[PDB]
Amino acid sequence: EEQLSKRLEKVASYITKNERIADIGSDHAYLPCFAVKNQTASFAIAGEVVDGPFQSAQKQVRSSGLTEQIDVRKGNGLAVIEKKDAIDTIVIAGMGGTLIRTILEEGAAKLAGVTKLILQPNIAAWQLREWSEQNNWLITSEAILREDNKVYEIMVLAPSEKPVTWTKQEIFFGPCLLKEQSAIFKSKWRHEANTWQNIIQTISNNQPVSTENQAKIRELEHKIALVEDVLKEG
Numbered sequence: 001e002e003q004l005s006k007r008l009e010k011v012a013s014y015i016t017k018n019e020r021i022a023d024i025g026s027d028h029a030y031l032p033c034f035a036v037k038n039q040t041a042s043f044a045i046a047g048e049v050v051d052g053p054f055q056s057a058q059k060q061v062r063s064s065g066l067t068e069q070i071d072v073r074k075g076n077g078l079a080v081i082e083k084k085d086a087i088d089t090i091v092i093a094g095m096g097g098t099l100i101r102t103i104l105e106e107g108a109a110k111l112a113g114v115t116k117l118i119l120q121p122n123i124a125a126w127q128l129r130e131w132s133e134q135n136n137w138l139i140t141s142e143a144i145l146r147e148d149n150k151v152y153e154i155m156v157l158a159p160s161e162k163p164v165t166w167t168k169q170e171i172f173f174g175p176c177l178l179k180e181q182s183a184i185f186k187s188k189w190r191h192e193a194n195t196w197q198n199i200i201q202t203i204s205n206n207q208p209v210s211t212e213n214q215a216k217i218r219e220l221e222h223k224i225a226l227v228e229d230v231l232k233e234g
Contacts, residue, residue: 001064004034006147007120007154011093014118014141014156015040019088022047022081024103025095029057029072033064044070045087047080078107089116093154097124101131117157125153129171136160142176144184151188153177169230172223178230186231193227193234196220 004012008031015021015035022045023032032044046061048054058072073080081087090111092100100121104111117137119128132139132155141156153174169178177185200220203213228234 001033001037002030004030006145007152008034008093010143010145010152010154011091011118011120012040014116014154015089015091017088018042019116020086021045021089021091022078022085022087023091023093024077024080025049025053025092026057027094028053029060029064029070031091031093032070033060033066036066036069037064041089042069045080045085046070046072047075047077048072049074049076077103078110081107081110083112087114089118090114091118091120093118093120094122097121097127101127104128104131104135115158118154119157120152120154122152125155125174126171128155129166129174132157133164133166133171136162136164138164139175142174142180144174144177144182144188146184151184169226172226173230189227189231190233193224196224200224 008027012031012035018039019041020043021032021035021041023029024047026032026046026048029044029046032041032046035041036044046057048057054072054074061067061070061072078090081090092103100119121128129139131137136159137157138160139155140158143154145152155174166175173189200217203209203217209217
């Protein structure tokens with residue numbers, strides 16, 4: 001068996017209770033195999049939408065001797081889940097935040113009985129924190145890591161019967177991540193804010209500035225102010 005990437009290892013680290021899981025758009029079923037093998041999961045669905053990855057995942061499951069504990073299924077999003085599967089945890093990793101959000105909204109019925117989501121968006125993480133507020137899922141854990149010079153965020157959610165209400169900083173940055181203030185968190189956001197300040201200068205010095213670009217500047221100022229507020233610097 002191959003070792004998981006640090007990204008997928010972090011995602012897997014949130015599967016803990018010998019759970020029934022579904023990994024949507026699974027990366028070769030590596031994570032389902034790792035979690036079944038090490039007993040942190042008792043059953044997995046590995047979902048795939050197209051041929052190459054569906055076949056690669058089937059072959060990994062067979063190679064692991066895990067065909068009795070892992071079902072590889074072809075389907076769009078949560079179409080691979082059925083009520084009778086009694087899934088406890090859903091993993092959706094390695095996709096953009098908007099796509100993940102769409103998967104969660106179109107597949108809303110399939111969230112019946114699910115008690116944990118582990119989501120790893122490659123862009124627009126804030127979209128999923130907004131979803132969490134609109135649908136009353138609490139964020140219970142988050143992580144931020146760097147692998148191959150790319151920064152990845154992971155969030156873990158659970159249903160809440162009480163309203164979930166975030167601040168705009170919690171949506172943009174992550175409620176757990178902004179409490180933690182890790183070195184990767186601080187470096188990522190200072191990096192982005194430096195780019196936004198640079199963009200403002202570039203636009204401002206190409207007079208005349210269009211009404212479209214004035215609005216862009218306002219947006220960039222807002223984002224920089226959010227970072228300054230969370231870092232308490234600048």
